[PDB]
Design an enzyme around this catalytic site. Sequence first.
Site, mmCIF file in Angstrom:
data_model
loop_
_atom_site.group_PDB
_atom_site.id
_atom_site.type_symbol
_atom_site.label_atom_id
_atom_site.label_comp_id
_atom_site.label_asym_id
_atom_site.label_seq_id
_atom_site.Cartn_x
_atom_site.Cartn_y
_atom_site.Cartn_z
ATOM 1 N N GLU A 1 -4.998 -12.597 4.287
ATOM 2 C CA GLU A 1 -5.791 -11.824 3.358
ATOM 3 C C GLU A 1 -7.259 -11.954 3.746
ATOM 4 O O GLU A 1 -7.693 -13.004 4.226
ATOM 5 C CB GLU A 1 -5.634 -12.379 1.943
ATOM 6 C CG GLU A 1 -4.235 -12.222 1.427
ATOM 7 C CD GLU A 1 -4.005 -10.892 0.748
ATOM 8 O OE1 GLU A 1 -4.473 -9.865 1.234
ATOM 9 O OE2 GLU A 1 -3.399 -10.929 -0.330
ATOM 10 N N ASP B 1 10.799 2.303 -2.289
ATOM 11 C CA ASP B 1 9.875 1.461 -3.093
ATOM 12 C C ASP B 1 8.433 1.669 -2.651
ATOM 13 O O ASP B 1 7.517 1.655 -3.470
ATOM 14 C CB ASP B 1 10.269 0.001 -3.035
ATOM 15 C CG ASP B 1 9.842 -0.784 -4.246
ATOM 16 O OD1 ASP B 1 9.932 -0.180 -5.369
ATOM 17 O OD2 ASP B 1 9.529 -1.958 -4.046
#
Length: 162
Positions: free
Chosen positions: A74, A99
């Site tokens: 991240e 999804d």
Amino acid sequence: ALSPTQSPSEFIAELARCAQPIAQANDLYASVMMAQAIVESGWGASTLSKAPNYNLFGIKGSYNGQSVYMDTWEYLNGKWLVKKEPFRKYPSYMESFQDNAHVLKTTSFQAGVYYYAGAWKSNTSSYRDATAWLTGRYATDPSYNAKLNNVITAYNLTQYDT
């Protein structure tokens, strides 16, 4: 197979069979969908993307309660950091495509506001608007749209759009 695959050409053709119909049915770019699978999964090599997880799209959280915890990069407050985070776990490759579309079409943090609305084809002039919208939303990588765009252009993925 999607994994292991003989070439990018193989992987792309197999992604298209799932992505084109789902993207068309959901007002999304197939090109962007296929780029996200390529970039998120590393051409289907990631542990997260392979059986028994089948998550081609780096989708976080849980899928009907099913999750797998994995180390993930991240970019937060100007730094790349390794974080352990919950990712969705699927019963086959198909549900991850469905999804991804569901996440883009329905994610909302405030009544009447769809967080990914700027990536819906009808809200764009080109796929580049959609990839730009995902950056800082879907993923923290500040170069996310450049990575998606570079895959789309290298492999002419807009051939799959309609």
